[PDB]
Amino acid sequence: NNYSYIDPTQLPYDHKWEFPRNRLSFGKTLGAGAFGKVVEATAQGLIKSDAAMTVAVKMLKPSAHSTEREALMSELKVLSYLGNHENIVNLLGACTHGGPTLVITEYCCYGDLLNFLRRKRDEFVPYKVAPEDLYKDFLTLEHLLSFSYQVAKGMAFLASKNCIHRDLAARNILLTHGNITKICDFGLARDIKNDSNYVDKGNARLPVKWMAPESIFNSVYTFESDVWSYGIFLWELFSLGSSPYPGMPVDSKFYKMIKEGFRMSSPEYAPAEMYDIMKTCWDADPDKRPTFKQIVQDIEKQISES
Numbered sequence: 375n376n377y378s379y380i381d382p383t384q385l386p387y388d389h390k391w392e393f394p395r396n397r398l399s400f401g402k403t404l405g406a407g408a409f410g411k412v413v414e415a416t417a418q419g420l421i422k423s424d425a426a427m428t429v430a431v432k433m434l435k436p437s438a439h440s441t442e443r444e445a446l447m448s449e450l451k452v453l454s455y456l457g458n459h460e461n462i463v464n465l466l467g468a469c470t471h472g473g474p475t476l477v478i479t480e481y482c483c484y485g486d487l488l489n490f491l492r493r494k495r496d497e498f499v500p501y502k503v504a505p506e507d508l509y510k511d512f513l514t515l516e517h518l519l520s521f522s523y524q525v526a527k528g529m530a531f532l533a534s535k536n537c538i539h540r541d542l543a544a545r546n547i548l549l550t551h552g553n554i555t556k557i558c559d560f561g562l563a564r565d566i567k568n569d570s571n572y573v574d575k576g577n578a579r580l581p582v583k584w585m586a587p588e589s590i591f592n593s594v595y596t597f598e599s600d601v602w603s604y605g606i607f608l609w610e611l612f613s614l615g616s617s618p619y620p621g622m623p624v625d626s627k628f629y630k631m632i633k634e635g636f637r638m639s640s641p642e643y644a645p646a647e648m649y650d651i652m653k654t655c656w657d658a659d660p661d662k663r664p665t666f667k668q669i670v671q672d673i674e675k676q677i678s679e680s
């Protein structure tokens with residue numbers, strides 16, 4: 375199955391989510407893949423008062439086949455199932471009748487974290503920010519720790535609901551107001567065929583540099599494989615949006631080195647204690663890797679200490 379613990383087809387879909395598609399006015403595309411897209415839209419009547427609201431709508435393109443159509447439905451059943459959580463992109467509604475299925479979520483105004491990190495890289499301040507220059511919205515080490523904590527909190531939640539992400543990366547984390555991170559999954563709304571972070575492994579285009587050895591060599595995805603990905607996310611975060619294993623292509627030598635125990639060194643801005651988390655996430659033995667709840671407790675202490 376394309377889901378390890380839960381079966382989304384057996385999961386129900388509450389019609390409390392059902393939203394009239396005529397009440398959706400579409401805007402610009404926030405992201406698009408071969409078979410799907412995420413578009414910005416204005417939803418009318420989503421609030422008790424006549425007030426309009428900005429939402430993000432995931433949908434398929436006419437290029438999509440039955441397997442993608444089924445994927446979008448199962449994705450909807452899972453989002454319905456998870457419900458409200460601060461560190462997860464929240465579902466607002468859906469359109470199942472009247473045409474193609476539309477998945478309506480909240481709009482995260484700052485977009486994906488990867489691009490945010492990249493545009494903030496050159497103005498990053500490791501130490502404390504001056505009171506005068508606070509308006510400039512400088513990225514600090516405090517924000518990075520807050521983001522690493524929130525993503526673990528979100529992942530801990532997902533894990534308690536027996537959900538495996540299978541693509542935990544900075545590109546699949548959105549940033550909203552108040553420096554709040556929200557785990558998402560662009561999936562079909564990402565052009566993986568042209569994204570250099572995805573690699574041809576057999577007949578698939580997989581994010582190999584974020585995958586645990588067991589996921590690469592056995593296509594087994596567990597709670598422990600998501601912890602590995604998180605460790606790579608931590609590297610991207612404290613590297614301020616750098617691509618993992620810089621200068622190393624995904625070749626025979628790459629696979630051999632990961633199997634043999636090669637692991638990235640600490641990014642330039644990673645506190646020593648955060649690198650310790652990354653090293654444990656990358657343990658060759660999945661049973662020796664921390665759980666997301668362990669990670670939460672670890673980061674929580676690091677935060678209090680500062």
Ligand SMILES: COc1ccc2c(Oc3cnc(CC(=O)Nc4cc(C)cc(CN(C)C)c4)c(OC)c3)ccnc2c1
Binds near residue numbers: 538
């Ligand atoms: C300003 O720029 C932007 C740019 C993009 C935006 C945005 O993009 C989206 C990303 N993804 C989805 C679907 C999704 O998140 N699925 C999903 C999420 C979780 C927590 C769990 C699972 C289960 N899987 C197996 C792990 C699936 C969207 O649906 C409409 C939109 C959302 C909000 N605001 C956006 C603002």
